[model samples]
Target: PSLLAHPGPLVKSEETVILQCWSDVRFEHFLLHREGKYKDTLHLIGEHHDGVSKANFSIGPMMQDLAGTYRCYGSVTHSPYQLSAPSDPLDIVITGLYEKPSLSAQPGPTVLAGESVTLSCSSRSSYDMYHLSREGEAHERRFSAGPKVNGTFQADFPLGPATHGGTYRCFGSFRDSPYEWSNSSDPLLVSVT
Candidate 1:
């Protein structure tokens, strides 16, 4: 069995995302499971193609609590106790959980190539973690929020060499809920000449 989220897993708050659970086995029903969430069980409909069966689980108006890991299982009526091998883990991350942070570049938004620059992010809400993401990049840089100064949490991400110039945004999150993040900061363009 294989479980996957439709339209990719990264979703914004109040948006809807669908989880598709499919298996080639001839199971009578499918079940979706996630920690701290209600388990959804759906009987397999007549829909089948080449011995593959699928079930769709719609989740949303997305919320922070809905963000987590999920898996699915398939079972037959004759042997309800026995379930097919669990599907691969699917991680659902929800954004816009809190207010947006502010992102600013130290050496100005535009800098010479190979110049040193620092991007600072601060938020009114106290979050333990901050993440910096560049446009068109899959991986984001994570930073632990330092002590609150003047009732604001801040994190500094220094780009030693401004070799890669692109649009960047920052997000804030608490330690307990890493997957749920604050609204993205306004995109700051860092042009490297």
Candidate 2:
């Protein structure tokens, strides 16, 4: 089975999102299971059309509790206990729940093409974790909160070979709320010469 989030997996708070689970093999029903701090399972009857079986789970005016990892399973009508292999894990990230942080690069934002640079995300809040994300990229780099300096909590992400230069932003969040993130930092352009 394949699981995908409509309108993308990243969403703002209070927004409704749809998760579609589909498979080539025909099945009578589907189950959407979530994993993390907040766990809830959803069951939906399957729809079959043109040799495809699918289920669409509508998740609400969103909140921190609705953000997490999810997987879907399929089963036949007579044998509900006999489930198909789980779908690939899908992560839902909720943003705009907390205050934004600051992103800065050491050795300047513009650097030699092959040199390394340290990108730091700092915030006044005592968040236990941070995420550094690059523009047009699907994934982010995670870092545990680094040593506190002058009442600010910071995390440093090192980029080597400087080939990864681009527009970057960071978010601050606590360990307990892994899927809920703060507002993104102002975009910082790191140009490599």
Candidate 3:
């Protein structure tokens, strides 16, 4: 069974959201769980003798406090330990925390192998910190810069004597709660010509 969050992965603050615990097999009971970075919370979302069961765990009038990962499972009423496999994790992120930033590339998007590339991310809102994320050659890369003047934030990547190319994006956040991120900017693609 899988836990599905509706109407989407991202939700607004204080908006009531529904989590559905469902399976193809007719389960007598369903359990909802919020898996934490450090702990796990469980709830008996549903129990019924009827055919295919679905547990709609409606939570909140949402809050920033409610943001996290969740999952679910099913079992026979008499056999809670005989649980179905855990659902794939579903994340609920609250937006409008800060505005999404914008990304751009210079020395233009296509450059010669030895040239340097600068990817800049800018925002119109004053923010505590800024972050740049890129799909690099080996893995995702993160760059951190701070504060804002005239609401601008930036990072530099010198892909000099370049080995390869990557796609880039960025966002803003508060320093105290870096995990709570602003919307990511649309990605900018740079390729070695």
Q: What's each prediction's clash count? A: 0, 0, 1
Q: What is the TM-score of each candidate against the true structure?
A: 0.64, 0.75, 0.54
lDDT string, candidate 2, 1-193, tens digits: 9999887787779988999999998878898999975677888889999999999999888887888899999988654457789999999889888889999999889998899888999888867788888877768888875554323388889887788669998988876667888888888999998
Q: Counting only residues 3 or more apart in sequence or on different chains, how many pairs clash (N, Cα, C under 3 Å) in candidate 2?
A: 0
> Per-residue lDDT of 101-186 in model 3, one digit per residue for the tens?
88787677787887787776777765556666555332333555434333335555555564467777666766566446687777
Candidate ranking under TM-score, highest first, comes to 2, 1, 3
Error of 3 at 122 (Å): 2.5
Q: Which stretches of candidate 1 lie over 4 Å from their true place?
A: 23-28, 37-47, 50-52, 78-81, 103-120, 133-141, 146-152, 156-169, 187-193
Residue 82, candidate 1: how far off, in angstroms?
A: 3.0
In model 3, what lDDT does residue 191 have?
86
Best by TM-score: 2
Residues 119-182 of candidate 1 have per-residue lDDT tens digits of 9999878778888988776578888755643234888999898997899999888876778988
Give each prediction's root-mean-square deviation over alpha carbons.
4.6, 3.6, 7.0
Could you tell me how far off, in angstroms, the CA of residue 135 lies in candidate 2 after the best superposition? 4.6
In terms of lDDT, model 3 sits at 0.67
Best by lDDT: 2
Give me the displacement of residue 32 in model 2, in angstroms. 1.4
